[PDB]
Amino acid sequence: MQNDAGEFVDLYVPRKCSASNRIIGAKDHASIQMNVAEVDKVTGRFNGQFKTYAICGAIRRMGESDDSILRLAKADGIVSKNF
Amino acid sequence: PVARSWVCRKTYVTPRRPFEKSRLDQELKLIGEYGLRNKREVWRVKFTLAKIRKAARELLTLDEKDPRRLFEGNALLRRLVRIGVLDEGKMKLDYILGLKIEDFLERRLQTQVFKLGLAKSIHHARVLIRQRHIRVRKQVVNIPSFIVRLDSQKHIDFSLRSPYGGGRPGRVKRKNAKKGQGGAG
Amino acid sequence: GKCRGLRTARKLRSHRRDQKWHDKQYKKAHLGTALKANPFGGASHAKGIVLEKVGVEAKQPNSAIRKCVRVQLIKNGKKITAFVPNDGCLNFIEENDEVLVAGFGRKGHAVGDIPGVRFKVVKVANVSLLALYKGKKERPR
Amino acid sequence: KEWLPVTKLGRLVKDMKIKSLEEIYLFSLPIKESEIIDFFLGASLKDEVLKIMPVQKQTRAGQRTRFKAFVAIGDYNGHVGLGVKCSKEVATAIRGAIILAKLSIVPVRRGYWGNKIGKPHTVPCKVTGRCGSVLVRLIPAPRGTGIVSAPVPKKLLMMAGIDDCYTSARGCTATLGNFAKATFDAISKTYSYLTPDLWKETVFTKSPYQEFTDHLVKTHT
RNA sequence: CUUUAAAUCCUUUAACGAGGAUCCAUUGGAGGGCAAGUCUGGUGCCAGCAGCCGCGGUAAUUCCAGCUCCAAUAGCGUAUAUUAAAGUUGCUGCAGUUAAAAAGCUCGUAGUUGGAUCU
């Protein structure tokens, strides 16, 4: 947070889910910080860098993390557009 | 039909829980270094501070740039800086909410006497205030629960009719001198 | 509440008054029969005359016979029991004397091991029982 | 006497490559090794025992009396915990309770009342906890007001560090365990309540294994 | 001396006036709630204490006496009403399967509450 002077005063900011825009608490041990690697455009080799996403526990417990990461890949363009 | 006033109000207040450890320990502490007679005095101080914080609460409840809020706040901070519990640089409307009992008890007359160096102990300061030895702007003061204003702080001195600051000796030194001259011859 | 109309006030007031009627303490404090059944008549203390000395028995495992006084109050005239509170205080009272009675403090109900007794003894012969027990004042003749 | 790490988190802390447990709270790793807290939260950690309530099950070979230990832990800067241990004699109950309270500590967020001026002092919003039949309200209060509650949640809110709060209680509050756990997941819910200040799109840094994966695979078996 | 119809009350001021400043501070309590002795002696389901749990049957942390200690302090305790705590009268803001609870069911007049759309 800020104040009247305007500096940072909170200890940290929590990360948010990439599907439901909900934050992840400290005692939410079902959340996943998995990484997606991208390929080279010319050959398909591993270029070295990555890009990640985040999912909360309740989406996995209800059972729709797979189609959520599917639409995240659709907006990302890693999966094919026709699918 | 009589010409009577019939107006009075309680000055102290009793807490809800009589038997406890913690708040008893802090009030016994502050009686320890500040030299108070009994718990009723700090109950009066707590009631006065609760009243001024409550008044600050409905003062800050009202919206900004309101005439009566601005007038009441300016008068309240002027009173709080003229009694000396605040300082002249920090005039803000919500810093009244961040003060405690020791700020109220700092401007007590016993604390000023003890910190001005004309008394040995706080108990000695209390018994010397109760014995009418101090003039304050040429006025003899007896009450130990006396609020000293900021402008009336440099005029604390011994009374001119006291034997400590210069005057006639009292009953006991005159008695010792009389028995000494009686036993001398 | 449940009836949540904008112009619903008379029905809610009627429901509230009927439900506050359906209670115990309010019906005790707003009916004349409860105060009429009280032998004190709504008074904190009363004066009466000792007429006999009664030793009543106790309850289960607490077993100690207790000594009580049947007192007839002057203002209304009915036989009302009263309990001598402290040790060694039954010898201070005699026959045909005036006794200032009061309850134990549980609002007209039986207290503790003593059955059926809701009043105690405060003052006899215009002197307190505490003064006679401590020995501060002597019982007049 | 010297500490031997068994968890890779403990190895990463001992290798002087984990700066604080704060990033562990950010990435929400579970903790099952109760001296990372001893390493980070030092002498400022304060301990206070609540009440010892004996339990028993009726058997043929006599009444045996297992003991339940109730405890709170935490420094005066945030992090606060609770621990319940069931054992026979008192000393191992007290030790297990303070250890299990050292496992389950959560940090709290401190907010303001009206004006965001100075250091934060109160809860940022209204959070509650629900277990058993206990409802514990957490309403923010102005500066210097003090905690108005039962004595056990006064003790818990000074362990948490909230100097000023307004509370409310409902249900059978005589049972200390349900009421204490209701206060605990009430004050642990001060994070999971989204504010407009947290509307910025978050960026994810590397996973805590990902900076020193080579170091952990060459120094951990 | 002042004040006052005139005094008394307050204030000022002579002469006095404290070393156990004898110029002597009480009230209910000490198991829990609820801050305070497993102190000592006496009776031992009797006398009693106890608002409530419960302390008394011959080793009374509660009875009765002495010492110490805690609470407020010229004040403290008790009984009657009353308020908050009572979110145990719930308008905010109680519940109705099993803890007290929905008429056996249906129609139905006042009363309650009523779709969208006009720059």
CSV table of C-alpha atoms (C1' of nucleotides) in Angstrom, one decimal, chain B residues 16-21 24 27-28 37-41 43 132 161 168 171 174-175 178, chain E residues 11-18 23 33-36 70-76 84-85:
chain,number,residue,atom,x,y,z
B,16,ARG,CA,-16.0,-3.0,33.4
B,17,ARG,CA,-13.6,-5.7,34.7
B,18,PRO,CA,-12.5,-5.0,38.3
B,19,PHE,CA,-10.1,-7.9,38.8
B,20,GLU,CA,-7.3,-8.2,36.2
B,21,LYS,CA,-3.6,-8.1,35.9
B,24,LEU,CA,-3.7,-2.8,37.0
B,27,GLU,CA,-1.8,2.1,36.4
B,28,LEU,CA,0.2,1.0,39.4
B,37,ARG,CA,-2.5,9.4,45.5
B,38,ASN,CA,-5.0,6.8,44.3
B,39,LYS,CA,-6.6,5.3,41.2
B,40,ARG,CA,-9.4,7.9,41.0
B,41,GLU,CA,-7.1,10.6,39.6
B,43,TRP,CA,-9.6,7.4,36.2
B,132,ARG,CA,1.6,26.2,49.7
B,161,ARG,CA,6.4,34.0,52.4
B,168,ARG,CA,10.4,34.1,58.2
B,171,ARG,CA,7.1,27.2,64.0
B,174,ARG,CA,11.6,29.2,66.2
B,175,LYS,CA,10.9,26.5,68.8
B,178,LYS,CA,13.7,29.3,71.8
E,11,U,C1',-9.9,33.9,53.2
E,12,U,C1',-5.6,37.0,55.9
E,13,U,C1',-2.9,37.4,60.3
E,14,A,C1',-1.0,37.3,65.7
E,15,A,C1',0.3,33.7,70.4
E,16,C,C1',0.2,28.3,70.6
E,17,G,C1',0.3,23.6,68.7
E,18,A,C1',3.7,16.2,66.3
E,23,C,C1',-3.1,13.9,66.2
E,33,G,C1',-15.4,-17.4,38.3
E,34,C,C1',-12.2,-13.5,40.7
E,35,A,C1',-6.6,-9.8,41.9
E,36,A,C1',-5.0,-12.7,47.7
E,70,C,C1',-4.7,-8.7,47.7
E,71,A,C1',-9.0,-4.8,46.0
E,72,A,C1',-11.1,0.5,46.6
E,73,U,C1',-9.9,4.4,50.0
E,74,A,C1',-13.1,8.3,53.9
E,75,G,C1',-15.0,5.3,52.0
E,76,C,C1',-17.1,0.0,51.7
E,84,A,C1',-26.1,-2.7,29.1
E,85,A,C1',-23.9,-7.4,28.7
